[PDB]
Scaffold this active site. Structure first.
Site, PDB file in Angstrom:
ATOM      1  CG  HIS A  54      -4.191 -11.712  -2.468  1.00 18.80           C
ATOM      2  ND1 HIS A  54      -4.979 -11.303  -3.524  1.00 18.80           N
ATOM      3  CD2 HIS A  54      -4.004 -10.620  -1.693  1.00 18.80           C
ATOM      4  CE1 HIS A  54      -5.269 -10.019  -3.383  1.00 18.80           C
ATOM      5  NE2 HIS A  54      -4.686  -9.581  -2.282  1.00 18.80           N
TER       6      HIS A  54
ATOM      7  CG  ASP B 245       2.237 -22.301  -0.628  1.00 19.19           C
ATOM      8  OD1 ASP B 245       1.381 -21.417  -0.797  1.00 19.19           O
ATOM      9  OD2 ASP B 245       1.933 -23.373  -0.078  1.00 19.19           O
TER      10      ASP B 245
ATOM     11  CB  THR C 101      -3.475 -20.365   0.877  1.00 21.30           C
ATOM     12  OG1 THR C 101      -2.847 -19.668   1.946  1.00 21.30           O
ATOM     13  CG2 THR C 101      -3.197 -19.579  -0.452  1.00 21.30           C
TER      14      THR C 101
ATOM     15  CG  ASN D 220      -0.843 -24.690   4.620  1.00 17.98           C
ATOM     16  OD1 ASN D 220      -0.612 -25.131   5.760  1.00 17.98           O
ATOM     17  ND2 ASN D 220      -1.346 -25.453   3.647  1.00 17.98           N
TER      18      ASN D 220
ATOM     19  CB  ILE E  94       3.114 -21.495   4.236  1.00 21.27           C
ATOM     20  CG1 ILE E  94       3.165 -22.078   5.646  1.00 21.27           C
ATOM     21  CG2 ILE E  94       4.104 -22.177   3.298  1.00 21.27           C
ATOM     22  CD1 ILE E  94       4.527 -21.828   6.382  1.00 21.27           C
TER      23      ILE E  94
ATOM     24  CG  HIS F  62      -2.189  -0.924   0.846  1.00 13.88           C
ATOM     25  ND1 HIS F  62      -3.419  -0.763   1.439  1.00 13.88           N
ATOM     26  CD2 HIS F  62      -2.321  -1.959  -0.019  1.00 13.88           C
ATOM     27  CE1 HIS F  62      -4.247  -1.687   0.986  1.00 13.88           C
ATOM     28  NE2 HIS F  62      -3.608  -2.419   0.094  1.00 13.88           N
TER      29      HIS F  62
HETATM   30  C1  HEM Z   1      -4.339  -7.148  -7.577  1.00 20.84           C
HETATM   31  C2  HEM Z   1      -5.082  -6.219  -6.961  1.00 20.84           C
HETATM   32  C3  HEM Z   1      -5.321  -6.322  -5.446  1.00 20.84           C
HETATM   33  C4  HEM Z   1      -6.491  -6.170  -4.818  1.00 20.84           C
HETATM   34  C5  HEM Z   1      -7.846  -5.847  -5.465  1.00 20.84           C
HETATM   35  C6  HEM Z   1      -6.276  -6.371  -3.414  1.00 20.84           C
HETATM   36  C7  HEM Z   1      -7.254  -6.310  -2.437  1.00 20.84           C
HETATM   37  C8  HEM Z   1      -7.119  -6.789  -1.145  1.00 20.84           C
HETATM   38  C9  HEM Z   1      -8.177  -6.865  -0.159  1.00 20.84           C
HETATM   39  C10 HEM Z   1      -9.631  -6.411  -0.395  1.00 20.84           C
HETATM   40  C11 HEM Z   1      -7.651  -7.388   0.967  1.00 20.84           C
HETATM   41  C12 HEM Z   1      -8.399  -7.649   2.284  1.00 20.84           C
HETATM   42  C13 HEM Z   1      -8.093  -6.546   3.325  1.00 20.84           C
HETATM   43  C14 HEM Z   1      -8.787  -6.964   4.597  1.00 20.84           C
HETATM   44  O1  HEM Z   1     -10.029  -7.031   4.576  1.00 20.84           O
HETATM   45  O2  HEM Z   1      -8.131  -7.236   5.633  1.00 20.84           O
HETATM   46  C15 HEM Z   1      -6.248  -7.658   0.742  1.00 20.84           C
HETATM   47  C16 HEM Z   1      -5.368  -8.242   1.642  1.00 20.84           C
HETATM   48  C17 HEM Z   1      -4.045  -8.549   1.411  1.00 20.84           C
HETATM   49  N1  HEM Z   1      -3.299  -8.178   0.296  1.00 20.84           N
HETATM   50 FE1  HEM Z   1      -4.167  -7.602  -1.552  1.00 20.84          FE
HETATM   51  N2  HEM Z   1      -4.942  -6.633  -3.217  1.00 20.84           N
HETATM   52  C18 HEM Z   1      -4.309  -6.627  -4.438  1.00 20.84           C
HETATM   53  C19 HEM Z   1      -2.953  -6.809  -4.653  1.00 20.84           C
HETATM   54  C20 HEM Z   1      -2.020  -7.163  -3.720  1.00 20.84           C
HETATM   55  C21 HEM Z   1      -0.586  -7.166  -3.886  1.00 20.84           C
HETATM   56  C22 HEM Z   1       0.120  -6.725  -5.192  1.00 20.84           C
HETATM   57  C23 HEM Z   1      -0.035  -7.620  -2.738  1.00 20.84           C
HETATM   58  C24 HEM Z   1       1.467  -7.821  -2.402  1.00 20.84           C
HETATM   59  C25 HEM Z   1       2.341  -8.294  -3.328  1.00 20.84           C
HETATM   60  C26 HEM Z   1      -1.122  -7.911  -1.817  1.00 20.84           C
HETATM   61  C27 HEM Z   1      -0.989  -8.401  -0.530  1.00 20.84           C
HETATM   62  C28 HEM Z   1      -1.992  -8.613   0.395  1.00 20.84           C
HETATM   63  C29 HEM Z   1      -1.844  -9.331   1.659  1.00 20.84           C
HETATM   64  C30 HEM Z   1      -0.589  -9.992   2.219  1.00 20.84           C
HETATM   65  C31 HEM Z   1      -3.204  -9.287   2.333  1.00 20.84           C
HETATM   66  C32 HEM Z   1      -3.575  -9.901   3.695  1.00 20.84           C
HETATM   67  C33 HEM Z   1      -3.548  -8.816   4.763  1.00 20.84           C
HETATM   68  C34 HEM Z   1      -3.875  -9.442   6.117  1.00 20.84           C
HETATM   69  O3  HEM Z   1      -3.712 -10.687   6.297  1.00 20.84           O
HETATM   70  O4  HEM Z   1      -4.304  -8.684   7.039  1.00 20.84           O
HETATM   71  N3  HEM Z   1      -2.308  -7.613  -2.458  1.00 20.84           N
HETATM   72  N4  HEM Z   1      -5.953  -7.294  -0.562  1.00 20.84           N
END
Ligand code: HEM
Ligand code: HEM
Lengths: 249, 249
Positions: free
Chosen positions: B162, B186, B179, B181, B184, B41
């Site tokens: 994700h 992967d 996932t 896991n 992890i 972000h």
């Molecule tokens: C492709 C477009 C993407 C969209 C539409 C998107 C959207 C979202 C949404 C809606 C969540 C849930 C937030 C929540 O409710 O806690 C989320 C979580 C997350 N995003 Fe994405 N995201 C995108 C790309 C990415 C990218 C590029 C990365 C890193 C390389 C990423 C890493 C993560 C991670 C690790 C979580 C989990 C956060 C947690 O466990 O609290 N996302 N994302």
């Protein structure tokens, strides 16, 4: 430092004909201040560092119209739409700046020079660039100086645009005219600013901020004393404003 | 096309020591996904045309924290603050990108190369640049391609982020892990994406959009078949992401 684009003879003819139609319409509808506001809110979003915002027709976008600063400008857009439809060759960018120039002229202000050729751009600037009425001199320099790239003189002269029109409690929350003659373009804004509060007349904190600044004050005094000098400096500042990011900014 | 700045030997030593401290802290606190989100972000707001936004420490600003996309990132900022205070020489820009790199490593992901020297910038980008989970392929190209300047391959590989973590109904409104896991790193994100809906697992419309695109799909297939290839492409995309507008973008 401007290099104005060539426009066709047909484009120029439509400018001339739109200018005349805008005079009649704005005079009849008594909407000069709103049209001046529309032109200023279009242009005033220019950010010199990123070359974004500015007078490029985006004020018609529902998204920019939704900006809280732009309360009531949807009326302005709506009012001009039938007229604009008579001049399909003109950009909205040009048409709205031309409305602003005409608003100043038909209320008896200076003749601000006008150069056609602004292109309508697809993306509105982000919200929050227009000045805050509750702030003072530092803020005004941030907005007009650091963002738009206008001078301290331009700030004071352009503030004189409040010589026409009024605030509305349903729009900004402020209420009433700055002058006793709000459809007459004159130096009354500065006279009223200097003489202090008077029943029925408005002063924003941003207007009051001109009085206490060591650079702004001498200009308030000059314009209050000399409407010719005000008109000269106003025409300069409005022209620069209307041309921000255009033909070189 | 990168030219990385020189930083002092003291700066480099603090990078090395912060990297180790970040490993221990993130592993203990089980907050890798949140830290990866914080880094993404921060970086994902870069706009190539205007050279604004990007990984320059502004995610700590209350104003950027107020962005609705950034729900829950104030926790991430708060969690890292004591640690950051042990490394006053490092920019927040660097520290947060380093947290992201470490988040990927401690969950067993590739080793993303890291170059120090990001400067903390005074102004957050405007809200609304981060991708919308409800949109599809056109939107993803607008955001990653037209704004950030990353490739179609980078979009699919980065979506693989994700593989760790979960959505929360109180934050985005979406709910649960992608996932089985979620701590992890992967290629399980792609395996689960392909096999369709499964009880307890999440797919956003933006994830599903990868399946139907003629360019994205072959990459989903490749990564599902070959975690080594995923790791290679992920490390490339994350590095580019973490360096947007930095040392030349
Ligand atoms: C492709 C477009 C993407 C969209 C539409 C998107 C959207 C979202 C949404 C809606 C969540 C849930 C937030 C929540 O409710 O806690 C989320 C979580 C997350 N995003 Fe994405 N995201 C995108 C790309 C990415 C990218 C590029 C990365 C890193 C390389 C990423 C890493 C993560 C991670 C690790 C979580 C989990 C956060 C947690 O466990 O609290 N996302 N994302
Ligand atoms: C200096 C900083 C400025 C501030 C803080 C400011 C703020 C405001 C506010 C709060 C209103 C009342 C809106 C409403 O409630 O209807 C207003 C109206 C108006 N402004 Fe300004 N403005 C500024 C500069 C300018 C400039 C540069 C111009 C043009 C040269 C201008 C022209 C006008 C006009 C003509 C109105 C009257 C609109 C009407 O009658 O409906 N203002 N402004």
């Amino acid at each position: 430092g401007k290099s104005y684009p060539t426009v066709s003879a047909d484009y120029q003819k439509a400018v001339e004909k739109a200018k005349k139609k805008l005079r009649g319409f704005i005079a009849e509808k008594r909407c000069a201040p709103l049209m001046l506001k529309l032109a200023w809110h279009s242009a005033g979003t220019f950010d010199k560092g990123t070359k974004t915002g500015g007078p490029f027709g985006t004020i018609k976008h529902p998204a920019e119209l939704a900006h809280s600063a732009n309360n009531g400008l949807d009326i302005a857009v709506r009012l001009l739409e039938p007229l604009k439809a008579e001049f399909p060759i003109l950009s909205y960018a040009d048409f709205y700046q031309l409305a602003g120039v005409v608003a100043v002229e038909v209320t008896g202000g200076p003749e601000v020079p006008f150069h056609p050729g602004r292109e309508d751009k697809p993306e509105p600037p982000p919200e929050g660039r227009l000045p805050d009425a509750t702030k003072g001199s530092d803020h005004l320099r941030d907005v007009f100086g650091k963002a738009m790239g206008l001078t301290d003189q331009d700030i004071v002269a352009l503030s004189g645009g409040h010589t026409i029109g009024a605030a509305h409690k349903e729009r900004s929350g402020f209420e009433g005219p700055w002058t006793s003659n709000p459809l007459i373009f004159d130096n009354s804004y500065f006279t009223e600013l200097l003489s202090g509060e008077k029943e029925g007349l408005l002063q924003l904190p941003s207007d009051k901020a001109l009085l206490s600044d060591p650079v702004f004050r001498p200009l308030v005094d000059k314009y209050a004393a000399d409407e010719d000098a005000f008109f000269a400096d106003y025409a300069e500042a409005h022209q620069k404003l209307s041309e921000l990011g255009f033909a070189d900014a």
